[PDB]
């Protein structure tokens with residue numbers, strides 16, 4: 001099955017035995033999923049189980065060289081969506097994108113890598129707009145980065161809580 | 177080159193041989 | 196086509 | 204020992220036992236950093252495993268970028284390891300006519316790996332070398348050997 005990675009993870013992240021739930025610890029650190037995609041359209045979900053005061057998350061997609069001891073979006077290897085204010089980040093540049101998200105929200109993550117490349121984020125099933133287009137070529141892994149002790153849970157499919165209207169994709173679980 | 181630790185199998189594309 | 200080999 | 208066990212040991216230990224440095228043979232080479240006993244695995248010639256039929260297309264692509272060395276290592280008639288853009292320190296192992304290492308294909312979980320083995324006991328400071336066994340080309344593209352062995356055949360081809 002697709003799961004949060006066993007070794008490809010910042011050691012200070014507290015990952016559950018089932019390897020779908022992760023709690024952050026102190027400054028931003030990151031964990032990638034066990035499987036990544038090079039071509040096609042793919043989708044997964046992340047639920048914010050708990051977001052205490054002064055905690056945050058940057059969620060999205062990472063190539064294998066994205067720095068695990070930095071937020072997602074820190075370098076050229078990843079693209080991320082920040083809980084606080086809905087900012088999107090890439091190479092440590094945050095730009096206007098959506099409204100924030102928080103405790104109880106179910107976030108959706110779409111990427112399309114055709115053999116025109118695109119990353120789109122969803123909030124409780126609703127398209128938040130194209131965040132990045134014509135991204136770097138390579139293998140992209142679902143990825144989670146957390147600031148302090150918030151808790152999120154990832155769902156790779158087959159069944160999503162809020163499957164998007166009129167969007168063609170395969171669930172990340174198909175890579176299993 | 178990009179450093180690697182293990183072999184990776186190349187995933188050919190459907191059009192791998194086409195003009 | 197010029198590659199290293201383990202035997203000729 | 205089952206070959207997968209000494210193969211993991213290889214992967215866990217190669218970085219500590221070898222290192223990349225300047226070479227008197229040519230440019231950069233791989234050097235022995237701790238004594239290696241005979242028959243032990245030294246390092247894997249790691250890379251992208253490709254079907255043999257893709258070899259020629261990739262070669263002309265690489266010459267269209269100017270890469271002058273061949274980093275492709277044939278496993279058998281059906282497959283080749285391509286270390287031109289992705290690979291490890293085994294890329295830098297030079298050729299010698301009196302080498303102290305040899306290459307050998309091993310089968311691990313239905314996949315083949317090219318592994319370099321110590322032909323004899325190898326001592327710290329020695330440069331690691333093996334016989335490339337390049338196919339013999341015509342004298343328009345002979346490459347002269349600078350391995351320094353007394354039994355040097357004077358080209359890699």
Ligand SMILES: Nc1ncnc2c1ncn2[C@@H]1O[C@H](CSCC[C@H](N)C(=O)O)[C@@H](O)[C@H]1O
Pocket residue numbers: 226228229230231232271272273294295296297298299347348349350
């Ligand atoms: N015995 C030898 N004599 C002269 N050149 C050699 C050689 N063995 C290897 N080479 C050179 O090294 C290349 C193999 S890649 C080996 C690494 C290279 N020595 C470097 O400095 O980066 C070959 O293309 C060849 O030109």
Ligand SMILES: [Zn+2]
Pocket residue numbers: 299300301348349350351352354355356357358
């Ligand atoms: Zn020689």
